[PDB]
Every structure is written in structure tokens, then in C-alpha cells.
């Protein structure tokens, strides 16, 4: 039976330099007997391929800065971005790779809020 991945919201608001959290839930625990938790976070900006931010639930991919972090247990996962910059705008997706078929969450658009002059 497919593991369904769900993100709590389709977009979340933030202002420059402030922090934000994006959530993801699985229907089954992603912790394997080997001790790894088979959860990825990706970002996809428009016009680009997706790029991995986090692997094994909490490990930063190379080149990813220290302001990103991940936490969770079992079936509840949170990605945090601590000091948001323009370049962070995009859609964030969780994905499980514990069992076939691999499944993505629906994505959460990070929306940087600005006043209308």
C-alpha cells in the first residue's frame, strides 16, 4: 500500500530575514531497522530542476547553508529556514524513499511578503 505524504499547507508566508517552518506527514513511519529515516526535502524554483536540501531526514546536502535544518520522528517532519533570503523563494517538497513507489508531498510555496508602494 502506498505511503502517502502530506504537507500541512500549500504556501506559507514570511518576510525577509525572518524564519519559517514547513511541515510534512507520512502515513507510515520512515524509520528503517537500519536506523536511517528515509525522508528528503527538495526545493524547486521556477525554471530550475529540483534540488535536494536534506537527506535522511536531517542531514544537509552539500552546498546547502546552515540556516536550513530538519527534524522529526517517525511520521512527522519539519523543515526550518532560520533567516530567509530572496533566493529561498520556491516550492519545498518532502519525499519518502522507504518503500516503492517513492512519494512526494504536495509542496509548499514559500511566499515572501512585501508591501505595495
Amino acid at each position: 500500500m502506498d505511503i502517502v505524504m502530506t504537507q500541512a499547507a500549500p504556501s506559507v508566508p514570511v518576510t525577509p530575514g525572518e524564519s519559517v517552518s514547513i511541515s510534512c506527514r507520512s502515513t507510515k513511519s520512515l524509520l528503517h531497522s537500519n536506523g536511517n529515516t528515509y525522508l528528503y526535502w527538495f526545493l524547486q524554483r521556477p525554471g530550475q530542476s529540483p534540488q535536494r536540501l536534506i537527506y535522511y531526514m536531517s542531514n544537509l546536502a552539500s552546498g546547502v547553508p546552515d540556516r536550513f535544518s530538519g527534524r522529526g520522528s517517525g511520521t512527522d517532519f519539519t523543515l526550518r529556514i532560520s533567516r530567509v533570503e530572496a533566493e529561498d523563494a520556491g516550492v519545498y517538497y518532502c519525499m519518502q524513499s522507504l518503500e516503492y513507489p517513492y512519494t512526494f508531498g504536495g509542496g509548499t510555496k514559500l511566499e515572501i511578503k512585501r508591501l505595495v508602494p
Partner: protein, 120 residues
């Protein structure tokens, strides 16, 4: 160092067939699998399946069983995705990835159009 390069955009009429390539470079092709990902308008990212580039064995998500075929030309370090009998709902950008290594192609945008398929 490492580059996955996909074939260019496709614009198609319903019922046609398309075949997209993904050529891998800068690592040993058969050491790592290739995954196919479908990026919609209004349906985020979908994992289509993956193919073992050493054995040739494919694993498909249930939703992609029927009209979709994964194949290889391993001597060319190339993986292919063929989509038969195109539907409007196949409109998307298709990515190849070596997901464990986080290598990504640039994407191939496929547009299935009843009345604009002739613009290229």
C-alpha cells in the same frame, strides 16, 4: 564534473508518441540508477519510477503503468522515457535524476495540444 542532459522540449498532438532522452556524464553510468519525475502544472512533483542502469530492470509507480516505458542505451550512458498515445494530462516537465547522488537533468517540457501542436 557531472552532467545529466535531456533532449529538448516537445509539442505534441493527442495520441502521438514521444521519446525523451537523458544522457549522463562524468560518473560511471551503471553504478547508479535513474529516476523519472513528472512535474505538473497544479500537481507538484510525481515519482514515475526508476531503472537499474546495471541490470536494466525498471520499477514503475502504478499510475505510470501502461503508456510509459523506461529504457537504456548503456553504451551511450543514456536513459530514455517513452510515452505512448499522449493525453492532455501528460503535459508536464519530465526530469531524470540519479536521486541518491542528487544529479538532475535540466527537464524536458512536453506539451500535448489539440490545436497548437504545429508551432514547432
Amino acid at each position: 564534473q557531472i552532467q545529466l542532459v535531456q533532449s529538448g522540449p516537445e509539442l505534441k498532438k493527442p495520441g502521438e508518441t514521444v521519446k525523451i532522452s537523458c544522457k549522463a556524464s562524468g560518473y560511471t553510468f551503471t553504478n547508479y540508477g535513474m529516476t523519472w519525475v513528472k512535474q505538473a502544472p497544479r500537481k507538484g512533483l510525481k515519482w514515475m519510477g526508476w531503472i537499474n542502469t546495471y541490470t536494466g530492470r525498471p520499477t514503475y509507480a502504478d499510475d505510470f503503468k501502461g503508456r510509459f516505458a523506461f529504457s537504456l542505451e548503456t553504451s551511450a550512458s543514456t536513459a530514455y522515457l517513452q510515452i505512448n498515445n499522449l493525453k492532455h494530462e501528460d503535459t508536464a516537465t519530465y526530469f531524470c535524476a540519479s536521486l541518491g547522488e542528487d544529479f538532475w537533468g535540466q527537464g524536458t517540457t512536453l506539451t500535448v495540444s489539440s490545436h497548437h501542436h504545429h508551432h514547432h
